[PDB]
Design a protein around this ligand. Structure first.
Ligand SMILES: C[C@H]1O[C@H](O[C@H]2[C@H](O)[C@@H](O)[C@@H](O)O[C@@H]2CO)[C@H](O)[C@@H](O)[C@@H]1N[C@H]1C=C(CO)[C@@H](O[C@H]2O[C@H](CO)[C@@H](O[C@H]3O[C@H](C)[C@@H](N[C@H]4C=C(CO)[C@@H](O)[C@H](O)[C@H]4O)[C@H](O)[C@H]3O)[C@H](O)[C@H]2O)[C@H](O)[C@H]1O
Ligand SMILES: C[C@H]1O[C@H](O[C@H]2[C@H](O)[C@@H](O)[C@@H](O[C@H]3[C@H](O)[C@@H](O)[C@H](O)O[C@@H]3CO)O[C@@H]2CO)[C@H](O)[C@@H](O)[C@@H]1N
Ligand SMILES: [Ca+2]
Ligand SMILES: [Cl-]
Length: 496
């Protein structure tokens, strides 16, 4: 469960949050494959409650109605078409598996669902599965409300309803088997693994029992005996009885400390400085690099959900965001996930975004296609961070330097830093309030290199900045503090 199952030489996944299956299929072919992306995390592909108050929020997809592959992203045929087309060009699909719970206990009975299946939260009847009252934790939970009230009690975190979401009885073989049937359906289609939603809300042993039932990956695309890549969503910032390490037996775990701390560093908050990143990784108290699933923001915290945090960087703070993402993709720690978002009309009333619920760009609830602008950006309010030159090119940097050691670190004791990855890549940052101008040892072969942040290598020249590495590996770098992108990155494949 620890190996990504990506193609050799591809090292990141991108979250195409709320994208339609047909758009992802094209994106794999026209962009992700040629640009060297490892894979795509998809939004939950199973039927959910259609919520009209408020109007079709992104979070309705975290309220399952059945395991039918029928959502605003598309139907089963469209989902199958996407997985096949993506695998065929060497780009993997990872499914956001919502398996802790069905929908909210207070949702009205009927057929207000993305495939029109009947369901009755009140009587606990989900006949499309099927589940009944016997399949939920109502009698196991010991809180007065039946909901999670207190994270200091590890038992209720697992047995009670997360924000009222009907809590599946994951200790029952029947429940485990219905979940496994869903996941095996997905695996056999050709899915490479899973983001396990709400893992903290499940016993590690119950997840293990589900995982025991899972097939090996599809033998047309994957070597025999390949196991689904598992990364579990556990928000562990310290101070709670449940630890991310509790989940290491099942696969990787999201490291939410990563983006929280990096955000603070890059904003220069709380006295933090880029020079402190010399021991980034386990040195900062993070989990082992071989288990960490790392990211600057996720779909929750970019809009203040989950642990939130003021320090979280997103596309809304585009300048600092690119630097954070660039740092992450350069550094060997963890397995990297890049966010890809849509814009919503963010509106703050007393420090909180009252539109933090708004779903994907839509016309009357129908998800807008991702249109591709002439400059390769996206239209229809899709942000497409993964198509931003600075991030896209750093995705390739990580590929180029895969497995090379962290070396040749430099810092000015404040916010001007640089480091190399073996003899394959080198990156320089200026986050101070003055110019960085210095000659540095790069660790690279002599030559002319295109800076992949300001531009591209195209048939014998560069469209951005050029760096000249002399015979002894030294190169001069000048980065103004007023620079729109105050960082430079060069690597073996950007050499002329
Ligand atoms: C969002 C994450 O919450 C949890 O995280 C905890 C940390 O674990 C903890 O250490 C500390 O930092 O606080 C955090 C925030 O509380 C959780 O551990 C983590 O897994 C969550 N991320 C996940 C999981 C889910 C659930 O699948 C996703 O959640 C999102 O979707 C939810 C469901 O649609 C959405 O909730 C909405 O719907 C519920 C039903 C509603 N609840 C109300 C209803 C009733 C009726 O009984 C009352 O009981 C409640 O009090 C009402 O508020 C919510 O109000 C409504 O928003 C949720 O907001 C949304 O984040 C998430 O996307 C995953 O990534
Ligand atoms: C294990 C520890 O990791 C993190 O601590 C950071 C800290 O947030 C950061 O400011 C910095 O602290 C030192 C640094 O170690 C030292 O080399 C430098 O001279 O001075 C810095 C402070 O002025 O780095 C450490 C990691 O080395 C977490 O933030 C913390 O919660 C956790 N206990
Ligand atoms: Ca649970
Ligand atoms: Cl996540």
């Amino acid at each position: 469960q620890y190996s990504s199952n990506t193609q050799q030489g591809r090292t990141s996944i991108v979250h195409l949050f709320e994208w339609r299956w047909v758009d992802i299929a094209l994106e794999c072919e026209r962009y992700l494959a040629p640009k060297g992306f490892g894979g795509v995390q998809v939004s939950p592909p199973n039927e959910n409650v259609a919520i009209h108050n408020p109007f079709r929020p992104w979070w309705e997809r975290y309220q399952p109605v059945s395991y039918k592959l029928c959502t605003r992203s598309g139907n089963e045929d469209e989902f199958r078409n996407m997985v096949t087309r993506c695998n065929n060009v060497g780009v993997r699909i990872y499914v956001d598996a919502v398996i802790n719970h069905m929908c909210g206990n207070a949702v009205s009975a009927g057929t207000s669902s993305t495939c029109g299946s009947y369901f009755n939260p009140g009587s606990r009847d989900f006949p499309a599965v099927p589940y009944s009252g016997w399949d939920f934790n109502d009698g196991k939970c010991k809180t007065g409300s039946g909901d999670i009230e207190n994270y200091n009690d590890a038992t209720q975190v697992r047995d009670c309803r997360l924000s009222g979401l009907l809590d599946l009885a994951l200790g029952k073989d029947y429940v485990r088997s219905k979940i496994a049937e869903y996941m095996n359906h997905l695996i056999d289609i050709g899915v490479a693994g899973f983001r396990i939603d709400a893992s903290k809300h499940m016993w590690p042993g119950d997840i293990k029992a589900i995982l025991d039932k899972l097939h090996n990956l599809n033998s047309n695309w994957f070597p025999e005996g390949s196991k689904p890549f598992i990364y579990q969503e556990v928000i562990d910032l310290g101070g709670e009885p449940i630890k991310s390490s509790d989940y290491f037996g099942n696969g990787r775990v999201t490291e939410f400390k990563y983006g929280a701390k990096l955000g603070t560093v890059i904003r220069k908050w709380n006295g933090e400085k880029m020079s402190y990143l010399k021991n980034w990784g386990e040195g900062w108290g993070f989990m082992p690099s071989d288990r960490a699933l790392v990211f600057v923001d996720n779909h929750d915290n970019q809009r203040g959900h989950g642990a939130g945090g003021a320090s979280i960087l997103t596309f809304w703070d585009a300048r600092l965001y690119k630097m954070a993402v660039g740092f992450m993709l350069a550094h060997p720690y963890g397995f990297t996930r890049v966010m890809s978002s849509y814009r919503w009309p963010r509106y703050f009333e007393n420090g909180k975004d009252v539109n933090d619920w708004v779903g994907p760009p839509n016309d009357n609830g129908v998800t807008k296609e991702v249109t591709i602008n002439p400059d390769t950006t996206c239209g229809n309010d899709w942000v497409c961070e993964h198509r931003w030159r600075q991030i896209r090119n750093m995705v390739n940097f990580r590929n180029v330097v895969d497995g090379q050691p962290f070396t040749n670190w430099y810092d000015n004791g404040s916010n001007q830093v640089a480091f190399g990855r073996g003899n394959r890549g080198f990156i320089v940052f200026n986050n101070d309030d003055w110019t960085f101008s210095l000659t540095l040892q790069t660790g690279l072969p002599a030559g002319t290199y295109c800076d992949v942040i300001s531009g591209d290598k195209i048939n014998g020249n560069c469209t951005g900045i050029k760096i000249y590495v002399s015979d002894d590996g030294k190169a001069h770098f000048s980065i103004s503090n007023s620079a729109e992108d105050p960082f430079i990155a060069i690597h073996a494949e950007s050499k002329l």
